[PDB]
Amino acid sequence: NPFQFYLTRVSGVKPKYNSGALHIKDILSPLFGTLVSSAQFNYCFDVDWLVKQYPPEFRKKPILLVHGDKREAKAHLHAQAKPYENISLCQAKLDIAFGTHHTKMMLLLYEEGLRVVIHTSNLIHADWHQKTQGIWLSPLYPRIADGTHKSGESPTHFKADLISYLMAYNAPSLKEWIDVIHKHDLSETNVYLIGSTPGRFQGSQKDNWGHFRLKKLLKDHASSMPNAESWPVVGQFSSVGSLGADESKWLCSEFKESMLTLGKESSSVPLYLIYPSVENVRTSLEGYPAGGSLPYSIQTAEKQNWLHSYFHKWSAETSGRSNAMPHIKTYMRPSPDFSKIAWFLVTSANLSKAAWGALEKNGTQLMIRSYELGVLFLPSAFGLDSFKVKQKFFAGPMATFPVPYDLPPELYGSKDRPWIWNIPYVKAPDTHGNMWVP
Numbered sequence: 321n322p323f324q325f326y327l328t329r330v331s332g333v334k335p336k337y338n339s340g341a342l343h344i345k346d347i348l349s350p351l352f353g354t355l356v357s358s359a360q361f362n363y364c365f366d367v368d369w370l371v372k373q374y375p376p377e378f379r380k381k382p383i384l385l386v387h388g389d390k391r392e393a394k395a396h397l398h399a400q401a402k403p404y405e406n407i408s409l410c411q412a413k414l415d416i417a418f419g420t421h422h423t424k425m426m427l428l429l430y431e432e433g434l435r436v437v438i439h440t441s442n443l444i445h446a447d448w449h450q451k452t453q454g455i456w457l458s459p460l461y462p463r464i465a466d467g468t469h470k471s472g473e474s475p476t477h478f479k480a481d482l483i484s485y486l487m488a489y490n491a492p493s494l495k496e497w498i499d500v501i502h503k504h505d506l507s508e509t510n511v512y513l514i515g516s517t518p519g520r521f522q523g524s525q526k527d528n529w530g531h532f533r534l535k536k537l538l539k540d541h542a543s544s545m546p547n548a549e550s551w552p553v554v555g556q557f558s559s560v561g562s563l564g565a566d567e568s569k570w571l572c573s574e575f576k577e578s579m580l581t582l583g584k585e586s587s588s589v590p591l592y593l594i595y596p597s598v599e600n601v602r603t604s605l606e607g608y609p610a611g612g613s614l615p616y617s618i619q620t621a622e623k624q625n626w627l628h629s630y631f632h633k634w635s636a637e638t639s640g641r642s643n644a645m646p647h648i649k650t651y652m653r654p655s656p657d658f659s660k661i662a663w664f665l666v667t668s669a670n671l672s673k674a675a676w677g678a679l680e681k682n683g684t685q686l687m688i689r690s691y692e693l694g695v696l697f698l699p700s701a702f703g704l705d706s707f708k709v710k711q712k713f714f715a716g717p718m719a720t721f722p723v724p725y726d727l728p729p730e731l732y733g734s735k736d737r738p739w740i741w742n743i744p745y746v747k748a749p750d751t752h753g754n755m756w757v758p
């Protein structure tokens with residue numbers, strides 16, 4: 321396969337559904353490279369657990385933790401890391417209210433080169449145990465010879481775009497990593513970077529981030545087909561923000577509009593949203609505790625009951641993962657019969673204005689609260705018009721894309737409800753025999 325898109329290992333599925341999955345120990349293994357230094361971008365960290373995931377021989381190599389925590393949370397993280405002398409920390413600035421450092425990324429510097437990992441898991445045991453999570457693995461990027469002058473740039477501009485993302489932090493520890501990236505050849509990269517950084521962007525910067533970045537890429541590097549109006553949009557996520565009092569406020573006016581873009585020319589496109597039902601969570605491998613990682617508060621939900629008619633159940637027979645709750649986030653554009661897709665995105669971004677950006681100032685400014693990162697698979701970047709959808713995620717012509725959940729998505733039944741994490745469920749017990757009492 322040319323895509324290098326993986327799922328994390330799930331404890332409790334049959335071995336056939338973990339063959340070709342990756343655990344964090346696999347990613348950090350010496351087989352992937354001889355580790356010199358690493359940066360771990362994330363939201364939540366268990367530092368004791370994280371160090372144990374590195375190979376023993378690599379556990380004293382420098383690690384930088386890039387986080388967004390403030391005040392007591394920030395103190396707690398420093399306390400976790402203090403026992404480890406080789407760990408430095410970078411507090412990503414969050415100057416807009418209610419922003420989060422949500423990006424999940426590893427920069428792995430080897431003796432042999434550099435690798436970039438953009439994924440969806442927090443660095444805690446439970447996120448890698450029984451959840452559906454996504455991983456993109458860069459190629460091993462070789463160093464550019466000292467004295468040689470070449471861009472090391474890819475047809476997708478990934479090297480410049482990654483550096484731009486890191487420059488947005490304005491952080492001394494990340495300039496080090498920028499200089500490391502400058503020294504390596506990333507020309508083999510066949511994915512496009514889609515990042516979110518906090519700020520208010522107008523003019524030339526509008527297209528740099530969030531859903532305008534996606535729109536810009538789809539305009540420039542995808543083609544519109546006949547009956548494009550019949551190609552649905554699919555969004556799949558583990559958290560929902562406040563989207564407004566009806567669909568015209570954000571969901572179908574700027575989010576959907578960015579996502580239905582194809583080609584340079586100038587809606588009844590179906591929109592499927594996939595988000596675990598209460599029954600999905602109750603009968604999951606983890607039981608109700610899985611809902612601790614599906615943050616949708618009752619306060620927000622009751623303001624937007626209109627949204628839930630878009631919701632479809634989590635189902636992933638194709639990867640044996642129907643009972644492994646999703647913490648991966650994906651967005652894609654399938655054909656009307658779901659046999660092809662025009663593109664696929666894996667990202668940290670949930671269904672949230674904070675993550676994707678919201679237009680301000682009479683449509684001239686895109687305001688983003690958070691750090692997010694994902695990678696976009698476009699057929700043009702692989703010499704293709706479209707991707708065939710892989711029949712079974714773990715089965716076997718290598719140019720079909722491994723969609724990790726079932727298509728078509730199944731609408732909620734009349735008695736289903738979206739998982740809402742801060743109300744009780746005491747009607748029926750979960751797979752461990754427990755109720756949920758927030």
Ligand SMILES: O=C(O)c1ccc([N+](=O)[O-])cc1C(=O)O
Binds near residue numbers: 363647
């Ligand atoms: O696990 C995370 O990284 C995470 C952190 C915060 C929020 N949030 O803001 O509600 C959502 C998530 C999520 O990805 O589900």
